């Protein structure tokens, strides 16, 4: 059977800037059981119908996964902009697939702050769709070169969410799985 258990129920998720991609192929999947689950706060499909998912046949299936803030989940959708969509994980305008998300405060928040999850704050240009940038070069916000040294106008490009369980929901961590279909 298709290995959705090891994507959705994985112990640790990736940082959004270093989002993970799992290829799903040569297996049988009951997509309807996912849709029927009450655990997901977001289940939005684009170019397909969730109910008629099981009937369909796909060339290739990709499952991308990462963690972001609740207030940023609306950026994981075609045609959206924002620090996440622009500089971390970009869906194409012609996306065919589903975006699945759920609150993971009990898993990914920690008293005192969990700082393992990061996002890219600084990038000169927007990401192309399904582009993944994992560089950690110092970002040059002025005309003087940084030469690997953080300082004025010389910024480390990644920032930590630092999730705390007392956060308001928009600041809480959400686990996201993006199913994209070649179809």
């Amino acid at each position, epitope marked *: 059977l298709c290995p959705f258990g090891e994507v959705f129920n994985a112990t640790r998720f990736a940082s959004v800037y270093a989002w993970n991609r799992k290829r799903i192929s040569n297996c049988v999947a009951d997509y309807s059981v996912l849709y029927n689950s009450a655990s997901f706060s977001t289940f939005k499909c684009y170019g397909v119908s969730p109910t008629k998912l099981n009937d369909l046949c796909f060339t290739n299936v990709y499952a991308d996964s990462f963690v972001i803030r609740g207030d940023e989940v609306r950026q994981i959708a075609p045609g959206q902009t924002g620090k996440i969509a622009d500089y971390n994980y970009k869906l194409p305008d012609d996306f065919t697939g589903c975006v699945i998300a759920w609150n993971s405060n009990n898993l990914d928040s920690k008293v005192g702050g969990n700082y393992n999850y990061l996002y890219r704050l600084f990038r000169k240009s927007n990401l192309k769709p399904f582009e993944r940038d994992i560089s950690t070069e110092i970002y040059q916000a002025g005309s003087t070169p940084c030469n690997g040294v953080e300082g004025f*106008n010389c910024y480390f490009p990644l920032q930590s969410y630092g999730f705390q369980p007392t956060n308001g929901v928009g600041y809480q961590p959400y686990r996201v799985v993006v199913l994209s279909f070649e179809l």
Partner: antibody
Framework: QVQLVESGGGLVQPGGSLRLSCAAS????????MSWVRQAPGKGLEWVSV???????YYADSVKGRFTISRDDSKNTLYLQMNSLRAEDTAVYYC??????????WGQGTMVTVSS | DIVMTQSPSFLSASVGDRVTITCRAS??????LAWYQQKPGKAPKLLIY???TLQSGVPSRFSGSGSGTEFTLTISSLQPEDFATYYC??????????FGPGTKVDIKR
């Protein structure tokens, strides 16, 4: 030095238009999060608009549809085009650079008066 | 929508006094808070970011503290140039760039 120099403020009638400019020195406008923040007489600070290095733009609900933020990389200058102005838009307008949403560099301000 | 409040709205103090201004968030915002000083007719000045990190060039008598819903700006020994209005600001907020309403510090007599 490092500074943001604003210009363009003045008197406008309600419904009118006005374009502010913010000429930067010591930082590159096009590679920064650049914002306009205003302060009406006797009131607090109100963020107005931001432009990202990659080009995305956002506006406060109070100005959406009427204001447009932009930049000229060759002149290292930030602009705010204000249309269909109203008396409540009367304020000192600041341009500013933010790092992780903290505004560390501010212009000196340019005053905008909207009155019939 | 998360609401930022500041207490007190007005504070009277003397040179040498210890001053504490509080900023409150209706929901938890971790350490997503900055503090500014503004004098009349001047642009605001960044004092603190990330709730407790002192901006470079800012005197050491300014310090910030707190995490979650309750934040504090402390001036350990007030100086004549510190009489001003102080604003907190919620970082990475939705909608963006929510400011607190300000605390004006004036000279006690």
């Amino acid at each position: 030095q490092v500074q943001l120099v604003e210009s363009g403020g003045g008197l406008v009638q309600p419904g009118g238009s006005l374009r502010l400019s913010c000429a930067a020195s010591g930082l590159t406008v096009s590679s920064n999060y650049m914002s306009w923040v205003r302060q009406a007489p006797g009131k607090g600070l109100e963020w107005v608009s931001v432009i990202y290095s990659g080009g995305s733009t956002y506006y406060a609900d109070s100005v959406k549809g009427r204001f447009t933020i932009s930049r000229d990389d060759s002149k290292n200058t930030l602009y705010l085009q204000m249309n269909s102005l109203r008396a409540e838009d009367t304020a000192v307008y600041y341009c500013a650079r933010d790092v992780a949403d903290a505004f560390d560099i501010w212009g000196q301000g340019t005053m905008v008066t909207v009155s019939s | 929508d998360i609401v930022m409040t500041q207490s007190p709205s007005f504070l009277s103090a003397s040179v040498g006094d210890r001053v504490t201004i509080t900023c409150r968030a209706s929901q938890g915002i971790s350490s997503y808070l900055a503090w500014y000083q503004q004098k009349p007719g001047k642009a605001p000045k960044l004092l603190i970011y990330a709730a407790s990190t002192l901006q470079s060039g800012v005197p050491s008598r300014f310090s910030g503290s707190g995490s979650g819903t309750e934040f504090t700006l402390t001036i350990s020994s007030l100086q004549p140039e510190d009489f001003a209005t102080y604003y907190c600001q919620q970082l990475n907020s939705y909608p963006p760039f929510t400011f607190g309403p300000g605390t004006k510090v004036d000279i006690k007599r």
